[PDB]
Ligand binder design. Structure first.
Ligand SMILES: Nc1ncnc2c1ncn2[C@H]1C[C@H](O)[C@@H](COP(=O)(O)O)O1
Ligand SMILES: NC(=O)CN1C(=O)CCC1=O
Ligand SMILES: NC(=O)CN1C(=O)CCC1=O
Lengths: 28, 19, 27, 17
DNA sequence: GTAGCACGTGCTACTA
DNA sequence: AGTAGCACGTGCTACT
């Protein structure tokens, strides 16, 4: 029920942290 | 939006770094 | 604890601030 | 970091432009 | 019913 | 030993 939401937010944080890592890779 | 902000700078860094 | 919490609130805010400075730089 | 990344990016963009 | 957000914690990591 | 930094859990508005 709500653990479904906590697990879904875990994927969203993983997505943001992915975008952080991508942006960092593009800057020397 | 934080996702949109990251995407933008990332897409503009990549473009502008290839000129 | 409250002191800990207080710093993180202020540290988050500096992250957001750093997020709005980056959106304002790119056209 | 995160903050490092935003500054670096903000400052890299500020110089290329 | 999901996406974006910010908060309150606890854990590791770095600072004088 | 305090202060950063990170990720989780979680209870919000708001959109599509
Ligand atoms: N666009 C959209 N998608 C999904 N759920 C929505 C939307 N707009 C409002 N709601 C809310 C309104 C109800 O409380 C709830 C029912 O599902 O969804
Ligand atoms: N990582 C990328 O460059 C591809 N991408 C995303 O994931 C969001 C916006 C965009 O252009
Ligand atoms: N407004 C600014 O000073 C730009 N800036 C900082 O001060 C730290 C690095 C960064 O992004």
């Amino acid at each position: 029920k709500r653990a479904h939401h906590n697990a879904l937010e875990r994927k969203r944080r993983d997505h943001i942290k992915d975008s952080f890592h991508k942006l960092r890779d593009s800057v020397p | 939006s934080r996702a949109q902000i990251l995407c933008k700078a990332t897409e503009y860094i990549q473009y502008m770094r290839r000129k």
